[PDB]
């Protein structure tokens, strides 16, 4: 029933769905607030109290599919997180270049959220998009170098990483799982 | 029609110089190199009077003198015809490929800061560098890329035509 390319791993659009199902800070451009003198929102998979209390030009916290849906309307503009600034990305780049053995303390959804906000929020960034995408590509490349260095330690027992992103888990999942499964199969056949 | 397909050759009939200003035809017959060295500048000014800013297309113009009234074969060339215009009938047997040649040769003296001045190539023998403009001795010389001009060069072996030679004799090669 399940397709062969969705058998033992997630597709990247399922990762997009998973990271669309998080809260995010946002600026409404419409007023749905009841004054002292309109059907309610009434959702069942997220808290609708922050969406019922939606005030124009304020900071609220809504789920990301609502964020993208309202950005398509341009009724509400998505605010980038703290780590999507040039200074914080430069700090992450310096941490990557400082400790070669350890990955930086980036969020798990740092590639997928960046792609979503680049392709959907082209006028919602205080810093320019240009150097932001340059630093995103630099962090992606240095994380690729670190996972290429760490792949020399493919052990039969176990293998650990600290702060690898979910999209990088789907980058490296079938290769690592198949190679370690066959290494374990070789050693378990080697046991008496 | 020089400007029409961006040609650089301006044909001049020698009979036109014979009809009007025959002193100019005599000066061209006696001293052809300096006369053409004036004539190319004259033809370039005459082109720029009709086609302004033509120097961007072709920096130098050239003139092909046509119909010299005296035709000399290769057997009849003597010492009196040197440094003069000759009209020679012959067949081309050997043609070499196109070769780039330095129109102006310039070199860098290694020991001195001064550079050697650009000298025009006569396409017969190389320019003999006896000394430098700052040091009166020979030194290492190599071509600078500051001002380089390249022109096409090709030798042909002009054998005399076998219908033109006396019957049974040998041809001549120039």
């Amino acid at each position: 029933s399940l397709p062969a390319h969705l058998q033992q791993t997630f597709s990247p659009e399922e990762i997009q769905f998973i990271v669309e199902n998080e809260p995010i800070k946002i600026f409404p451009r419409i007023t749905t607030r009841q004054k002292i003198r309109h059907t309610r929102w009434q959702l069942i998979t997220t808290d609708d109290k922050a969406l019922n209390n939606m005030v124009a030009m304020r900071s609220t916290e809504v789920v990301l599919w609502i964020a993208l849906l309202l950005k398509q309307q341009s009724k509400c503009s998505i605010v980038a997180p703290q780590w999507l600034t040039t200074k914080e990305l430069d700090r992450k780049i310096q941490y990557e270049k400082t400790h070669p053995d350890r990955f930086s303390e980036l969020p798990w959804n740092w590639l997928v959220l960046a792609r979503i906000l680049f392709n959907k929020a082209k006028d919602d960034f205080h810093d320019p998009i240009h150097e932001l995408r340059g630093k995103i590509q630099d962090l992606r490349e240095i994380r690729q170098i670190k996972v290429l260095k760490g792949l020399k330690y493919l052990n039969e027992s176990h293998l650990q990483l600290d702060n690898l992103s979910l999209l990088e888990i789907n980058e490296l999942r079938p290769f690592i799982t198949e190679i370690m499964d066959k290494l374990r199969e070789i050693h378990t056949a080697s046991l008496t | 029609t020089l400007g029409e397909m961006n040609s650089e050759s301006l044909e001049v009939n020698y009979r036109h110089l014979a009809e009007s200003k025959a002193i100019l035809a005599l000066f061209l017959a006696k001293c052809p190199e300096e006369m053409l060295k004036i004539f190319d500048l004259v033809a370039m000014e005459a082109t720029e009077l009709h086609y302004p800013d033509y120097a961007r297309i072709h920096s130098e113009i050239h003139v092909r003198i046509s119909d010299f009234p005296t035709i000399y074969s290769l057997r009849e060339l003597r010492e009196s015809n040197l440094s003069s215009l000759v009209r020679v009938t012959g067949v081309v047997t050997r043609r070499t490929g196109v070769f780039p040649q330095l129109k102006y040769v310039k070199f860098n003296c290694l020991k001195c800061g001064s550079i050697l001045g650009p000298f025009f190539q006569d396409s017969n023998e190389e320019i003999r560098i006896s000394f430098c403009t700052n040091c009166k001795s020979k030194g290492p010389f190599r071509v600078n890329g500051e001002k380089t001009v390249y022109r096409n060069y090709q030798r042909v072996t002009l054998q005399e035509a076998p219908g033109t030679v006396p019957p049974g004799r040998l041809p001549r090669h120039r």
Partner: protein, 171 residues
């Protein structure tokens, strides 16, 4: 696995072996009609016979000789340069046969050799799978030197990288 078709072709390969008993009536093993098998007969049989013919038999019925695919020459060639070795010309399913030989004959040195070989060609497999053209000779000659399970792993990794490339790079 029962239904693994790669395992079915792995069991279909023939191994050299020696007959230990004088067994009449099995002349169709060596394509003869009716020849009884003499004592100490050298013959190539498929693995689905000789895997448990060496078990049942004390002296078992069939002795499994060391084949050319596990010889000292092949072991030394693997130990020298694991990357540019052409495993496809040796056997198309060398690794599954290696796993079955290790499970049958518990050899520790062969286990270390095949583990080290799998690690070194897995590095090069990952290097060729992560490369997406916007095919080179240096990758396709290595695809010419790959096994069926190894090109299966390469296909999984390469379609994973290509699908996430088109997801990240366009809608």
């Amino acid at each position: 696995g029962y239904y693994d078709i790669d395992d079915v072709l792995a069991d279909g390969t023939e191994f050299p072996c020696k007959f230990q008993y004088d067994i009449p009536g099995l002349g169709y093993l060596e394509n003869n009609p009716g020849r009884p098998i003499t004592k100490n007969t050298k013959l190539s049989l498929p693995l689905w016979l000789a895997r448990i013919l060496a078990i049942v038999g004390p002296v078992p019925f069939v002795e499994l000789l060391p084949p050319d695919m596990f010889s000292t020459k092949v072991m030394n060639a693997i130990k020298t340069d694991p990357v540019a070795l052409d495993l496809h010309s040796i056997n198309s399913h060398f690794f599954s046969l290696a796993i079955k030989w290790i499970m049958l004959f518990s050899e520790k040195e062969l286990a270390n050799v095949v583990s080290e070989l799998l690690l070194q060609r897995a590095q090069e497999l990952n290097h060729h799978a992560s490369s997406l053209s916007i095919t080179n000779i240096a990758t396709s000659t290595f695809l010419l030197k790959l096994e069926e399970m190894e090109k299966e792993i390469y296909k999984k990794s390469h379609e994973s990288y290509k699908d996430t490339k088109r997801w990240m790079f366009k809608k």
